[PDB]
C-alpha cells in the first residue's frame, strides 16, 4: 500500500512515495540517492519524534489513509554536521495573502 510523503529539511522538500511495509532505513536510502548523504548521516522524524531504522512506515504512523497523493505526510530530516547532528529544522511555506472582499 503506497504512502505519499514530503521529506523536509530547512528549505528542501522531497516529494516521493513508498510502501507502508517499507522501513525507515529504506527511506534513508531513497534520501541518499537524492541529497547524496548516507543513512548514518541522516535522522528521520514524524513531528518531534526520531524514527527507528527497523520500523516500517506504517508502524511510524505513515498510513495510506494519512499520507495521500493530494495531501502527503511530512517526514522531518536532519543531517549530521561533522561530529553532531543538527537540530530538526523545517522552514515553513509562505503565508497566503488575505482573501479578497469578493471571495
Amino acid at each position: 500500500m503506497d504512502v505519499f510523503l514530503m521529506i523536509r529539511r530547512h528549505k528542501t522538500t522531497i516529494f516521493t512515495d513508498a510502501k507502508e511495509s517499507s522501513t525507515v532505513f529504506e527511506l534513508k536510502r531513497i534520501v541518499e540517492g537524492i541529497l547524496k548523504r548516507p543513512p548514518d548521516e541522516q535522522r528521520l522524524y514524524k513531528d518531534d519524534q526520531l524514527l527507528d531504522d527497523g520500523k516500517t512506515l506504517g508502524e511510524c504512523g505513515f498510513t495510506s489513509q494519512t499520507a495521500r497523493p493530494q495531501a502527503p505526510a511530512t517526514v522531518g530530516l536532519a543531517f549530521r554536521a561533522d561530529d553532531t547532528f543538527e537540530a530538526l529544522c523545517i522552514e515553513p511555506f509562505s503565508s497566503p495573502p488575505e482573501l479578497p472582499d469578493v471571495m
Partner: protein, 90 residues
C-alpha cells in the same frame, strides 16, 4: 529514477520525479530548452508546494479505476494557484 528541482519565489526547493514535473508543458520547455533546476520568480512556496501535490495526484489517479478523491484547494490560495496553473499549462 530522475528527479528535478523546482524553486519557489521565496527560495524553497521542491524535488519531484522528472515524470511528474513533465505534467506541465511549460516546465518541460524550461528543462529541455543548474541543468534539472527551474526557478519560479512569480510562484511562492504556498502555491508551488500545492502544484507538486497536484502532479502526484494527477500521476496517481490518471486512468485509474480506484475512486478518485477531490483535489483540495484552500480558498486563500485559489487565485494564485489559478495563475500558476495557467502559466504551467496543467
Amino acid at each position: 529514477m530522475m528527479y528535478v528541482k523546482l524553486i519557489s519565489s521565496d527560495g524553497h526547493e521542491f524535488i519531484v520525479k522528472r515524470e511528474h514535473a513533465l505534467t506541465s508543458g511549460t516546465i518541460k520547455a524550461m528543462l529541455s530548452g543548474e541543468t534539472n533546476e527551474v526557478n519560479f520568480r512569480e510562484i511562492p512556496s504556498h502555491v508551488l508546494s500545492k502544484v507538486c501535490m497536484y502532479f502526484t495526484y494527477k500521476v496517481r489517479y490518471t486512468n485509474s479505476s480506484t475512486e478518485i478523491p477531490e483535489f483540495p484547494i484552500a480558498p486563500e490560495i485559489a487565485l494564485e494557484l489559478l495563475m500558476a496553473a495557467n502559466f504551467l499549462d496543467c
